[PDB]
Design a protein around this ligand. Structure first.
Ligand SMILES: *[C@@H]1O[C@H](CO)[C@@H](O[C@@H]2O[C@H](CO)[C@@H](O[C@@H]3O[C@H](CO)[C@@H](O)[C@H](O[C@H]4O[C@H](CO)[C@@H](O)[C@H](O)[C@@H]4O)[C@@H]3O)[C@H](O)[C@H]2NC(C)=O)[C@H](O)[C@H]1NC(C)=O
Ligand SMILES: *[C@@H]1O[C@H](CO)[C@@H](O[C@@H]2O[C@H](CO)[C@@H](O)[C@H](O)[C@H]2NC(C)=O)[C@H](O)[C@H]1NC(C)=O
Ligand SMILES: *[C@@H]1O[C@H](CO)[C@@H](O[C@@H]2O[C@H](CO)[C@@H](O)[C@H](O)[C@H]2NC(C)=O)[C@H](O)[C@H]1NC(C)=O
Ligand SMILES: *[C@@H]1O[C@H](CO)[C@@H](O[C@@H]2O[C@H](CO)[C@@H](O)[C@H](O)[C@H]2NC(C)=O)[C@H](O)[C@H]1NC(C)=O
Ligand SMILES: *[C@@H]1O[C@H](CO)[C@@H](O[C@@H]2O[C@H](CO)[C@@H](O)[C@H](O)[C@H]2NC(C)=O)[C@H](O)[C@H]1NC(C)=O
Ligand SMILES: *[C@@H]1O[C@H](CO)[C@@H](O)[C@H](O)[C@H]1NC(C)=O
Ligand SMILES: *[C@@H]1O[C@H](CO)[C@@H](O)[C@H](O)[C@H]1NC(C)=O
Ligand SMILES: *[C@@H]1O[C@H](CO)[C@@H](O)[C@H](O)[C@H]1NC(C)=O
Ligand SMILES: *[C@@H]1O[C@H](CO)[C@@H](O)[C@H](O)[C@H]1NC(C)=O
Ligand SMILES: *[C@@H]1O[C@H](CO)[C@@H](O)[C@H](O)[C@H]1NC(C)=O
Ligand SMILES: *[C@@H]1O[C@H](CO)[C@@H](O)[C@H](O)[C@H]1NC(C)=O
Ligand SMILES: *[C@@H]1O[C@H](CO)[C@@H](O)[C@H](O)[C@H]1NC(C)=O
Ligand SMILES: *[C@@H]1O[C@H](CO)[C@@H](O)[C@H](O)[C@H]1NC(C)=O
Ligand SMILES: *[C@@H]1O[C@H](CO)[C@@H](O)[C@H](O)[C@H]1NC(C)=O
Ligand SMILES: *[C@@H]1O[C@H](CO)[C@@H](O)[C@H](O)[C@H]1NC(C)=O
Ligand SMILES: *[C@@H]1O[C@H](CO)[C@@H](O)[C@H](O)[C@H]1NC(C)=O
Ligand SMILES: *[C@@H]1O[C@H](CO)[C@@H](O)[C@H](O)[C@H]1NC(C)=O
Ligand SMILES: *[C@@H]1O[C@H](CO)[C@@H](O)[C@H](O)[C@H]1NC(C)=O
Ligand SMILES: *[C@@H]1O[C@H](CO)[C@@H](O)[C@H](O)[C@H]1NC(C)=O
Ligand SMILES: *[C@@H]1O[C@H](CO)[C@@H](O)[C@H](O)[C@H]1NC(C)=O
Ligand SMILES: *[C@@H]1O[C@H](CO)[C@@H](O)[C@H](O)[C@H]1NC(C)=O
Ligand SMILES: *[C@@H]1O[C@H](CO)[C@@H](O)[C@H](O)[C@H]1NC(C)=O
Ligand SMILES: *[C@@H]1O[C@H](CO)[C@@H](O)[C@H](O)[C@H]1NC(C)=O
Ligand SMILES: *[C@@H]1O[C@H](CO)[C@@H](O)[C@H](O)[C@H]1NC(C)=O
Ligand SMILES: *[C@@H]1O[C@H](CO)[C@@H](O)[C@H](O)[C@H]1NC(C)=O
Ligand SMILES: *[C@@H]1O[C@H](CO)[C@@H](O)[C@H](O)[C@H]1NC(C)=O
Ligand SMILES: *[C@@H]1O[C@H](CO)[C@@H](O)[C@H](O)[C@H]1NC(C)=O
Ligand SMILES: *[C@@H]1O[C@H](CO)[C@@H](O)[C@H](O)[C@H]1NC(C)=O
Ligand SMILES: *[C@@H]1O[C@H](CO)[C@@H](O)[C@H](O)[C@H]1NC(C)=O
Ligand SMILES: *[C@@H]1O[C@H](CO)[C@@H](O)[C@H](O)[C@H]1NC(C)=O
Ligand SMILES: *[C@@H]1O[C@H](CO)[C@@H](O)[C@H](O)[C@H]1NC(C)=O
Ligand SMILES: *[C@@H]1O[C@H](CO)[C@@H](O)[C@H](O)[C@H]1NC(C)=O
Lengths: 432, 124, 121, 121, 121
């Protein structure tokens, strides 16, 4: 009566190590497995599987992998310890517009040279957000000097978010939920087995999610607990909103030798006029998009509820603004022009630029972003929002963010990792 | 309602050969094992052969073991029995029947559930 | 037809014809260690199942018929329900609590016949 | 006599008496990773061949006689040429294009008898 | 009863009923390498013994009866002393010098019957 089968199509929830695969990067370079040009996907008929995007450890793994890869790409680069000196700074007033009056500072300092016996007097431009006035009214220091060592990113390694595919090790499988109108939790039909995830771009941003995937039919609202005001709401658009960002300043770069085989990349004089960095969002598109978002929020809050949008709360620049990295430079844009309405050309968002960046939410590891020559222009898709609900007839929504896991959870919500358990027994009617 | 319809020649010379067949309908053919049973002109029933639902296993009564072949084709819903050599003692009505074995992953039968009407074969 | 886990939603007797499909899918130094650990583990898991089939007398088989009777207390169902209605995922849940008992019995009966076979030689 | 690969230039039937000779030869952290990868790979390659023999019903054997007929289109030669004139290196080249067909057929015939053997019990 | 190595002080015939007990117990990057090397080695040692049982025709068994006669020069003792008085540790010392001879003979007799079995088919 007892019979033993091996190769039985049974699985259990599991947590394992996934490996990266992909078709001068910060992240995946040669330490990444080449992908399968014709990957498989198998539809599972009559299979219902429970998914929970808020308990998905693929998110934790991706967070750890991208931070570790980030650090490994800075480890061999030039230390800028010799740069933490007293700076003598004045204002840049040459062909400066009103929007940036006081934003750039012209600083001179005594830097080391290839030879230990000699110093050189050099100057460079810094943004006001990179420096601290000390004491002598022209004396400044870089912002990180009392907190951390700073290194210069190697200007050969780009920050372009080249996609990574996560693949399961043998004995494991990745299940994908294809059920449209899947809100991140509970069971879903239409489950398929895949070898690897689709390519997910490690785009780093706050408030607005850029260059991600789109919802299949309608705008979707996902949250761990929609009635808990301490939780974030991830909003996935079913259409992109195009955003055009720029730094309209023709910059030049100069190399300062600071030691035997090391150089600092400094910003030289700006060619032409000096103007403020900004992003343009089409107003009509934004308005239609916001339309769809409210229609869906009402499904959870009432169709007779007043829904208001408001700008972010105060706090650190890295959280209160829309942070992104494009063209190799780090932008901090003011989104109060996008979130200012009751219910529901172009909208111009002014932006600030920084050179000294404290990544993720760490303290102790700062990096200096070498300046980029020429003029930067970026075109990207807003594919979703991170909102926080401020809270009896109205609700207020504000932009949120800063926890990078929310930016990956939004792409990995469809995937689950399971472990295959090939043995099983059953009654039959035979006897050895 | 199911049907089993035997067809095939009914008159042969000894030393020759004969093929009988049985068309089935009204049930999933592939779910059942099948067999042939003889009715002697003036006596009782005798089991002759048995075939598995998948057609891979065949069994015979010793008296026809080196002479008869039982075959099954699940795409046409048919059985066939190929007789060779033929003896006077093989004159009988040959019945097509559903049952006889089992598939070891389901309840056993070891009995015959359905019968056709039978082909009459005379060996001269 | 469908490949790996394609039969997952099929009944137990519709499945179990695909056993080779699943059996074949079981097969900067920090990234090196992570990948090796994943590969070493796949090997270790594979070998534990093979050792277990070996001690039960099922080495080299995907379908092994044993000499242990089924206890109706493990699952009081007939063959028609088990093989024609249920899927393997459902079955695994139904008898989860009896797996270790069954495994112990399978080992014991193999030890007994392994010895009887020596006495007969 | 000669050891590993000593029979490589011998004919197929002169060779194939040395199967255990070849079967037994299949078994600063950066240098650590390189060596472990080589060792892990040797294990994985060994196990894939063993799994394959297993699903074909040839587990535990070096010479396994199967139930799949030879198609003359794969190689229209008689036994005298294959076993007395040819070497295994030459043979492997001659039928390279049919290897996957043959492997698929071997798996299928094992699945069929594995099931027939259950029905007979 | 006692678990792993519990029978170590028992006689050979009292032991050898516990074979599955022992068989189942055979299964910062610097610490990573040390642990992986230990795990890889456990796998390699396991597989070498399994390969060896395979070439002797004992695959899948814990107790394998062979076709090689015992040479009294290896140990001139009767069954009563070997199975009822001696332990396996004592026995291993007594015949240590003949282990490689015995292993060679076991391989040879398997090669011969493996071939005879082909001629009979
Ligand atoms: C959202 O996706 C879009 C596209 O999918 C992406 O926009 C792309 O950004 C990259 C980087 O800014 C653009 O490529 C650059 O284009 C400029 C044009 O003058 C070139 O000069 C750049 O080349 C220099 O830098 C390279 C770095 O390795 C050097 O190798 C090279 O020699 C040059 O020095 C570079 O080509 C790209 O064109 C756009 N794509 C489009 C369609 O505009 C956008 O950034 C994504 N959004 C976010 C926030 O990531
Ligand atoms: C490093 O220096 C900065 C700048 O002086 C310190 O940050 C200031 O801390 C005071 C404390 O009352 C605040 O009021 C200022 O607004 C802070 N300035 C900024 C720009 O945030 C910082 O705390 C110092 N770090 C350490 C470790 O002492
Ligand atoms: C930043 O200050 C430097 C001086 O510290 C300016 O450079 C000088 O510009 C005058 C203009 O004729 C030249 O004659 C000097 O020789 C320049 N000095 C050096 C060291 O080159 C610089 O132009 C200022 N930059 C900005 C943007 O205001
Ligand atoms: C983001 O942009 C808005 C819009 O330009 C800034 O809003 C101004 O804030 C000051 C602060 O009291 C108000 O007095 C102005 O009237 C505001 N303007 C408008 C049009 O509302 C806002 O301050 C910017 N945020 C930050 C952090 O700089
Ligand atoms: C913004 O989103 C649109 C819509 O998804 C992207 O354009 C699509 O790109 C895919 C790539 O295979 C094409 O198959 C679609 O037909 C494109 N849609 C249209 C309407 O042309 C667009 O590339 C995205 N922009 C960025 C910067 O990623
Ligand atoms: C402002 O730009 C014009 C453009 O030619 C240039 O000639 C002028 O010198 C610039 N002014 C300063 C102070 O650099
Ligand atoms: C630079 O501009 C700011 C604008 O408020 C002013 O307060 C500051 O004193 C100026 N610095 C110099 C050196 O003139
Ligand atoms: C550089 O060192 C000299 C030494 O006398 C000092 O006078 C000068 O101010 C220093 N330069 C700066 C920009 O501090
Ligand atoms: C998501 O769908 C499940 C399906 O039952 C539902 O229970 C859950 O409450 C939904 N999520 C929200 C935020 O309503
Ligand atoms: C959602 O948040 C509310 C806020 O108090 C809490 O009471 C409720 O239990 C939460 N939901 C779940 C499923 O815990
Ligand atoms: C944004 O719109 C203004 C409106 O005149 C335009 O001048 C500016 O160039 C636009 N910016 C971008 C990045 O297209
Ligand atoms: C962005 O640039 C494209 C052309 O590259 C233009 O068609 C589009 O309207 C721009 N978007 C905005 C918001 O200005
Ligand atoms: C957004 O769309 C609504 C639709 O009625 C319209 O009334 C509103 O003025 C629009 N807002 C903008 C900024 O165009
Ligand atoms: C909200 O929409 C639902 C959809 O069926 C409807 O039944 C309900 O009455 C609506 N509420 C209001 C206030 O219109
Ligand atoms: C939000 O808008 C108000 C308008 O008064 C402004 O004071 C506040 O600073 C804005 N907050 C941010 C983070 O931009
Ligand atoms: C927000 O809406 C009010 C409505 O009167 C408008 O006056 C204000 O300028 C808007 N704020 C921004 C930042 O556009
Ligand atoms: C920056 O100025 C240089 C000066 O000749 C010019 O050639 C270059 O094209 C300018 N860059 C841009 C983006 O206009
Ligand atoms: C899924 O269930 C339907 C129900 O009739 C069945 O016909 C179908 O074959 C099932 N899927 C598979 C893979 O068997
Ligand atoms: C069947 O299981 C019960 C306990 O679940 C046990 O008492 C009984 O003896 C078992 N049957 C046999 C034949 O051992
Ligand atoms: C046996 O199969 C029949 C089919 O209807 C089912 O009703 C009966 O309950 C089954 N036996 C057991 C033990 O459940
Ligand atoms: C089990 O399969 C049989 C096949 O005819 C069907 O009649 C029966 O209703 C099925 N039972 C269940 C619970 O699906
Ligand atoms: C298995 O154990 C759990 C523990 O609570 C129990 O609830 C469940 O019913 C048991 N399963 C069976 C089939 O008795
Ligand atoms: C090599 O070829 C010669 C040709 O006669 C043959 O006799 C010899 O035995 C071959 N070598 C081996 C290892 O058989
Ligand atoms: C032999 O191979 C040919 C194609 O190479 C194929 O058509 C033929 O059917 C095969 N023979 C058998 C018995 O299948
Ligand atoms: C059979 O062996 C003979 C030996 O001379 C050879 O000539 C003949 O061609 C062989 N058969 C085939 C199919 O080649
Ligand atoms: C094959 O071996 C036979 C053995 O006598 C020999 O006569 C024949 O010529 C050989 N053929 C080739 C091609 O070497
Ligand atoms: C195997 O495929 C290659 C591809 O060109 C072909 O040339 C060769 O002749 C084929 N081998 C056989 C034995 O047909
Ligand atoms: C140890 O030796 C004594 C001697 O009589 C024996 O009885 C006992 O069983 C031995 N231990 C074991 C594990 O057999
Ligand atoms: C037994 O071993 C001796 C040498 O130890 C050897 O000479 C003798 O031939 C062996 N017996 C047999 C039957 O081979
Ligand atoms: C056989 O067993 C007896 C038991 O006393 C022992 O004395 C004798 O020496 C044994 N035979 C050999 C070869 O030692
Ligand atoms: C071996 O076991 C027998 C069992 O009766 C015992 O009499 C004999 O003395 C034992 N021999 C030794 C050496 O212990
Ligand atoms: C095994 O070899 C050693 C080497 O000195 C020898 O002393 C020992 O007696 C040998 N063992 C036997 C059983 O002869």
């Amino acid at each position: 009566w007892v019979t033993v089968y091996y190769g039985v199509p049974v699985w259990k929830d599991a947590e394992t190590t996934l490996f990266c695969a992909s078709d001068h990067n910060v992240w995946a370079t040669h330490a990444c497995v080449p992908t399968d040009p014709n990957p498989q996907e198998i539809h599972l008929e009559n299979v219902t599987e429970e998914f929970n995007m808020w308990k998905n450890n693929m998110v934790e793994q991706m967070h750890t992998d991208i931070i570790s890869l980030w650090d490994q790409s800075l480890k061999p680069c030039v230390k800028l310890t010799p740069l933490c000196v007293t700076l003598q700074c004045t204002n840049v007033t040459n062909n400066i517009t009103d929007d940036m009056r006081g934003e750039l500072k012209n600083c001179s300092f005594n830097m080391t040279t290839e030879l230990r016996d000699k110093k050189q007097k050099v100057y460079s431009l810094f943004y006001r957000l990179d420096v601290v006035q000390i004491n002598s009214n022209k004396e400044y220091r870089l912002i990180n000097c009392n907190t951390s060592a700073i290194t210069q990113a190697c200007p050969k390694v780009s920050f372009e978010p080249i996609p990574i595919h996560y693949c399961a090790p043998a004995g494991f499988a990745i299940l994908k939920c294809k059920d449209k109108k899947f809100n991140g939790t509970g069971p879903c039909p239409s489950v398929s087995t895949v070898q690897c995830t689709h390519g997910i771009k490690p785009v780093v941003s706050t408030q607005l999610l850029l260059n991600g995937s789109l919802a299949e039919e309608e705008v979707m609202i996902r949250s761990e607990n929609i009635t808990n005001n301490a939780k974030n709401i991830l909003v996935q658009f079913n259409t992109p909103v195009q955003i055009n960002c720029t730094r309209p300043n023709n910059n030049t770069r100069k190399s300062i030798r600071i030691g035997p085989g090391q150089a600092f990349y400094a910003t030289g004089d700006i060619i032409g006029d000096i103007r403020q960095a900004h992003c343009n969002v089409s107003k009509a598109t934004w308005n239609e998009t916001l339309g769809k978002v409210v229609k869906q929020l009402r499904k959870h809050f009432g169709n007779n509820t007043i829904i208001r949008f408001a700008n972010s709360s105060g706090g650190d620049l890295e959280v209160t603004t829309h942070s992104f990295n494009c063209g190799g430079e780090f932008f901090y844009c003011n989104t109060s022009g996008l979130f200012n309405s009751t219910w529901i050309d172009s909208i111009t968002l002014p932006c600030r630029i920084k050179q000294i960046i404290n990544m993720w939410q760490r303290i102790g590891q700062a990096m200096y972003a070498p300046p980029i020559q020429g003029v930067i222009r970026c075109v990207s898709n807003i594919t979703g929002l991170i909102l926080t609900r401020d809270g009896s007839t109205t609700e207020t929504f504000r932009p949120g963010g800063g926890d990078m896991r929310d930016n990956w959870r939004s792409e990995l919500y469809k995937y689950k990792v399971v472990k295959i358990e090939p043995l099983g027994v059953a009654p039959t009617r035979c006897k050895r | 309602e199911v049907q089993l319809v035997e067809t095939g020649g009914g008159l042969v010379q000894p030393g020759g050969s004969l093929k009988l067949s049985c068309r089935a309908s009204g049930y999933t053919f592939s779910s059942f094992a099948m067999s042939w049973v003889r009715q002697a002109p003036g006596k009782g029933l005798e089991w002759v052969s048995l075939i598995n639902d998948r057609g891979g296993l065949t069994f015979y009564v010793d008296s026809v073991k080196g002479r008869f072949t039982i075959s099954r084709d699940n795409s046409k819903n048919t059985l066939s029995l190929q007789m060779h050599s033929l003896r006077d003692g093989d004159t009988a009505v040959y019945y097509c029947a559903t049952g006889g074995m089992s598939s070891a992953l389901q309840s056993s039968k070891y009995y015959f559930d359905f019968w056709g009407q039978g082909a009459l074969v005379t060996v001269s | 037809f469908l490949g790996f886990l394609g039969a997952a939603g099929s009944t137990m007797g519709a499945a179990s014809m695909t056993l080779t499909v699943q059996a074949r899918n079981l097969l900067l130094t920090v990234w090196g260690i992570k990948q090796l650990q994943a590969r070493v583990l796949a090997v270790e898991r594979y070998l534990r199942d093979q050792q277990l089939l070996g001690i039960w007398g099922c080495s080299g088989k995907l379908i092994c018929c044993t000499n242990v009777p089924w206890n109706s207390s493990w699952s009081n169902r007939n063959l028609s329900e088990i093989w024609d209605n249920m899927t393997w995922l459902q079955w695994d849940k139904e008898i989860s609590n009896y797996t270790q008992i069954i495994y112990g019995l399978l080992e014991e009966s193999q030890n007994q016949q392994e010895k009887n076979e020596q006495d007969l030689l």
